[PDB]
């Protein structure tokens, strides 16, 4: 259970002494799903000091809260925070000195890389006053 | 297999029909002049055995190479070393499923098609005989790669501690074949509901390449094998045609037999050609005698003089029509398209006039530019046809001025600046300012501003709308004959078979009589046109005293000397005469007084 932010390979504790971590087969039958979307937000008009490139961030809607967020309106959110990296996986090969903190983050137990950490945000419940 | 081979060296040296013994008697006749090729004609092959055909028509690639090796051995025998391998050319005529069977059963099966080739590519090289060296022990082998499943039929092995891939491709003892990657387009009349057509890809061999120019109908026989290129989801592949024999129609580079000109010389001895073509060109056109004479001289042309200094004379003519609707100015133009050797039909809107001449683009390999398209690069020797010279107001005028009168364009765009050759001949048909009221007012206002386009053309007809209450009923008698009952399919087979000329014989005919005789007008005939011209300018200036302005200049005068050169190409006489030249001005003097009215 509990596939993490990159755990596309459940490879722990087989029943018999078979070849553990040898393969997998993502069954579309029993593994129940849920539906989501990824939208961007923006800061309200009555708080900007000047035209000073008003920054933003990104959210994730998880439950039934999909499609309740009509785009282009003043809106409120739940408030759980999160940080999500994704640089090393099975498929595709993974300016300034952005990600300079990442050099500290090296040398995990798997292969030596430069793993970053970017701030993001998760929601649970939406409301739209106005 | 070897057994199968034993069954072809023992077959292509004694197959015959009744005492002609043909296949030895052309293989010898193809080893003297260097061609190294066969024409099996598979429908004529079947006389041995249906089984040996059926080991061919059900399985591929293996059969072609075994047959090729057998032919090479027989060729080697007919001699007593410089002996190359041969190539095959097969041909049949079953029927052409046009572009509909795609995947069902026609994968690696013999097939016959029909299309129009539009796009050639530059040549290339693949190898066929190699000599391979190893790094570690200086081993030496030789591997031949004949037929294909494109490359990667077999790869270089590992055999000769010893490191893998130890082998290299030297270039000192090798041979090479060229491929094409020319692209076939569907003949645009036989997939009709509402859809755009599609396209395929095809390669070939050296001794049957460079036999096509774009703009022709071709029939083609070959294989439907499948390659796989890794520069899309499921593990897919792509289709292409390995081709064998382009036994198409004529070229439409003047090599042909002798009996094709035998009847042509037997026809040209009859001095009735000029009056009979005016009937025999357009079998569904009510008369229009003055215009019909102008089309046969446009298709033939004059000459090209590169006289001993730098300049040259533009030896061709360019007619122009205009007139009321409903008077055959448009439907006549599809008729000249099929009869021409090379003909292009871009007759609408001008089609973004900068794109008429040449175009560049970013090209996906190497991110570069070169020159690809144009409506004038492909139409050399032949004739283009366009219309609607009123409501192309943007840039049609600036795109034909350099294109005409010197035929030497040069593209000044981001890459090359080259003067590519052109020998084109233009043709157009337009509308005046709604026809009728233009011919009931001051007789200008035809082209609204410029006379400078009219001075580049020379020959101009002006049709009109009379009310002759006698001949029109014969025209109303004429259209009901052709339109239903179709008796002209039976009338023009019971008056044509001894008198008239069919529509496809002229396409055979014009390409021969142009490319042989280089004519010249009579030198004592120069007194005639000089005495003719001096009153025409007097006939001009008698009108300008009436507060009348506009167009006649000297360029039409050096067009009449091309007009009298035109019928000399028809009669194929190297000298001209005076019965010749007086009929030519008889055509132009019926378009001299048009400037008055």
């Amino acid at each position: 259970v509990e596939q993490s932010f990159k755990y596309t390979e459940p490879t722990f504790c087989p029943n018999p002494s078979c070849e553990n971590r040898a393969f997998w087969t993502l069954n579309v039958t029993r593994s129940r799903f849920l539906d989501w979307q990824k939208v961007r937000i923006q800061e309200n008009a009555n708080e900007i000091p000047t035209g000073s490139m008003p920054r933003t961030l990104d959210v994730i809607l998880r439950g039934d809260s999909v499609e309740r967020a009509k785009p282009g309106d003043r809106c409120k959110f739940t408030g759980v925070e999160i940080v999500v990296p994704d640089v090393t996986q099975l498929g595709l090969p993974g300016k300034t000195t952005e990600g300079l903190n990442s050099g500290v983050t090296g040398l995990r137990s798997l292969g030596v890389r430069d793993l970053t950490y970017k701030i993001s945000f998760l929601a649970c419940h939406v409301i739209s006053i106005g | 297999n070897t057994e199968i081979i034993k069954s072809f060296k023992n077959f292509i040296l004694e197959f015959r029909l009744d005492s002609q013994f043909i296949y030895r008697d052309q293989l010898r006749n193809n080893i003297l002049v260097k061609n190294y090729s066969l024409t099996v004609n598979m429908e004529h092959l079947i006389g041995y055995n249906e089984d040996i055909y059926k080991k061919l028509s059900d399985e591929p690639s293996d059969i072609i190479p075994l047959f090729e090796t057998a032919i090479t051995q027989v060729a080697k025998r007919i001699s007593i070393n410089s002996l190359p391998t041969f190539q095959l050319i097969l041909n049949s005529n079953a029927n052409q499923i046009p572009l509909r069977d795609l995947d069902s059963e026609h994968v690696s099966k013999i097939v016959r098609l029909s299309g129009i080739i539009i796009s050639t590519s530059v040549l290339s090289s693949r190898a066929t005989y190699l000599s391979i060296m190893c790094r570690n022990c200086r081993h030496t082998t030789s591997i031949t790669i004949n037929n294909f499943n494109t490359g990667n039929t077999v790869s270089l092995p590992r055999s000769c501690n010893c490191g893998p891939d130890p082998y290299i491709i030297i270039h000192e003892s090798s041979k090479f074949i060229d491929q094409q990657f020319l692209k076939l387009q569907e003949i645009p009349e036989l997939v009709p509901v509402g859809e755009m057509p599609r396209n395929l890809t095809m390669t070939c061999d050296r001794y049957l390449t460079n036999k096509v120019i774009p703009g022709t109908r071709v029939t083609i026989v070959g294989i439907y094998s499948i390659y796989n290129s890794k520069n899309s989801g499921v593990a897919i592949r792509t289709p292409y045609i390995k081709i064998l024999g382009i036994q198409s129609d004529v070229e439409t580079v003047t090599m042909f037999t002798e009996e094709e000109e035998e009847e042509f010389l037997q026809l040209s001895r009859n001095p009735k050609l000029y009056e009979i073509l005016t009937n025999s060109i357009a079998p569904s056109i009510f008369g229009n005698e003055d215009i019909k004479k102008a089309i046969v001289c446009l298709l033939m042309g004059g000459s090209k003089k590169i006289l001993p200094d730098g300049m040259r004379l533009r030896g061709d003519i360019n007619v122009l029509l205009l007139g009321d609707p409903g008077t055959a100015k448009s439907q006549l133009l599809k008729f000249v398209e099929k009869v021409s050797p090379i003909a292009v039909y871009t007759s609408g809107k001008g089609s973004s006039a900068a794109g008429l001449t040449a175009s560049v683009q970013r090209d996906p390999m190497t991110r570069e530019f070169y020159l690809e398209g144009g409506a004038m690069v492909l139409a050399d020797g032949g004739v283009v046809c366009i219309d609607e010279f009123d409501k192309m107001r943007d840039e049609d005028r600036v795109a034909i001025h350099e294109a005409m009168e010197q035929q030497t364009i040069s593209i000044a765009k981001a890459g090359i600046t080259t003067v590519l050759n052109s020998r084109t001949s233009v043709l157009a048909a337009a509308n005046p300012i709604y026809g009728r009221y233009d011919d009931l007012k001051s007789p200008g206002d035809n082209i609204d501003f410029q006379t400078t386009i009219l001075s580049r053309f020379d020959m101009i007809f002006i049709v009109k709308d009379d009310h002759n209450e006698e001949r029109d009923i014969s025209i109303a008698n004429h259209v009901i004959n052709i339109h239903t009952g179709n008796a002209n399919a039976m009338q023009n087979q019971q008056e044509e078979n001894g008198s008239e000329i069919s529509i496809e014989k002229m396409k055979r005919y014009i390409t021969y009589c142009r490319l042989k005789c280089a004519p010249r007008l009579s030198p004592q005939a120069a007194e005639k046109l000089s005495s003719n011209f001096v009153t025409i300018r007097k006939q001009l200036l008698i009108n300008e005293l009436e507060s009348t302005e506009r167009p006649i200049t000297i360029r039409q005068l050096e067009a009449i000397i091309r007009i009298t050169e035109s019928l000399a190409k028809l009669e194929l006489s190297p000298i001209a005469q005076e019965r010749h030249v007086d009929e030519a001005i008889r055509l132009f003097q019926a378009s001299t007084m048009d400037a008055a009215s």
Partner: protein, 594 residues
Amino acid sequence: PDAVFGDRVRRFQEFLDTFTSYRDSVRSIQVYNSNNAANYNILPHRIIISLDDLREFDRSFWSGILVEPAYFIPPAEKALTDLADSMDDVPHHPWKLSFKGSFGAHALSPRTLTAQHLNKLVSVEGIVTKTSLVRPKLIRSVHYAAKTGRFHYRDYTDATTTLTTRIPTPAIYPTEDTEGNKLTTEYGYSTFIDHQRITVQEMPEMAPAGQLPRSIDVILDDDLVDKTKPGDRVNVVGVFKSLGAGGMNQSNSNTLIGFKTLILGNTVYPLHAARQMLTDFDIRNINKLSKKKDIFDILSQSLAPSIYGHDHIKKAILLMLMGGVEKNLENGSHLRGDINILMVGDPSTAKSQLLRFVLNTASLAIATTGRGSSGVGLTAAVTTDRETGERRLEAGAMVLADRGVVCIDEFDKMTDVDRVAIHEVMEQQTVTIAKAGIHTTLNARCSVIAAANPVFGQYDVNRDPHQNIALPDSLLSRFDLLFVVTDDINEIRDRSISEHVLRTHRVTIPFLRKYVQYAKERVIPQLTQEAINVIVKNYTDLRNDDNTKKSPITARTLETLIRLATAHAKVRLSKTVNKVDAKVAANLLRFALL
């Protein structure tokens, strides 16, 4: 190499009679290189073996050079290098060949390929339009051990030996040879060579129109680099060669060609159809043909032998084409030492006929046709990555116009882009741009030839003679001569016209082009204190008779009135400004202004 060397050995004793006439030539070219350089207070190693002298008395040694030219060239090098030191060694670079002669039907136009003479000799002509970079490349470095003080020696082969199929050495600096010495390398004692990739088009006149011009490419070496300008009728001949691995590489090379056709060649020859040599005989005839007092009038009508009259025009072209000098001001802006004439005419009066026969006698002046594209005098940062990671400003049409002439058509029938383009490049000799790269002030000495048509038909007499076509008068001010071609009807004129179009369906040109390209390199008088006096009287009257007549003039028109007479004395080939030059310059303007 025992059996593959005896015929190489037999050639070494054979062809020593073939350079009975060149064994002087091989040593005489280098004894002054041993004397120029030793006494400073320069030539490559080029040994032109004629094909005749080898064909004249050898067959088997001759036949291999046009069938299998892959075993036979480093023979002729190997004899040639030991016949240089054995000639001259006492004073304390392999002398490769050039190989000129005839060939016997190997003039393969590269629209056609070979099917039989792959990997053989081939003569190829055409025009080049690519002109890629220049970059050095090693052949051999010399390693050195600092400890124990002894050197080493290593050669690295590439696709430049042209004939042998060497095992490649893809190493850059093999360090730490079988010792314990930290290796060094004297790079001054190393040796280097350069490459240049150039693609050649087809000469687009003898290729019959069924295709666009194709192209192949050629890799040459150090002797003939920077020799070919883009736009030269070049002639080259070298070996034919394929390289690269293709079709049988490790996996999945389906329907991919793998044989890059290349040419490793020699002897790049310009042609002319600057090289015009002339003896004492023909150089004295033009001195004898500088003698008469009529040669400006004879040369005028001996130019275009098809069109009547326009002797004001026919003198103007030859006056312009030879051109005038520009004395550049020391620490000052030079003025417009070029000359830029213009024509306009009511249509079909041969106003465009005479613009293209100047291109046959152009003397390396290739013009465009004026198509509505930006690139007339710029690049717009076309780089094509210059083989993966380099940016170059490839010149459009001003690398060719330098000390030459151009001609373009349909001035009024253009968009606004060329109007600002010919603005700067006329008042200023050069152009400078940082499109996506760097500013660069590349120079160009050029001169235009114009052509345009009036819009409103036959209206050049009933309206203003000025403001007549309304293209911006900045260009009209920057040009001088605006000829208005008349075509009025005279009954003897057109009668004479009617026969001269009939007698053209059947003192000379190459003597004419030799005359100007010899008179472009002689003296320039500029000075006569009284010929300058008559012209200012010849101007100030019409300076007071400019508004009382049709056209107003400006002050820069005075710089025309010296410049026409300056080149008019160049027709005389004299170091003195005479008096008679100030009469042709008068009435030529008097026809252009009345």
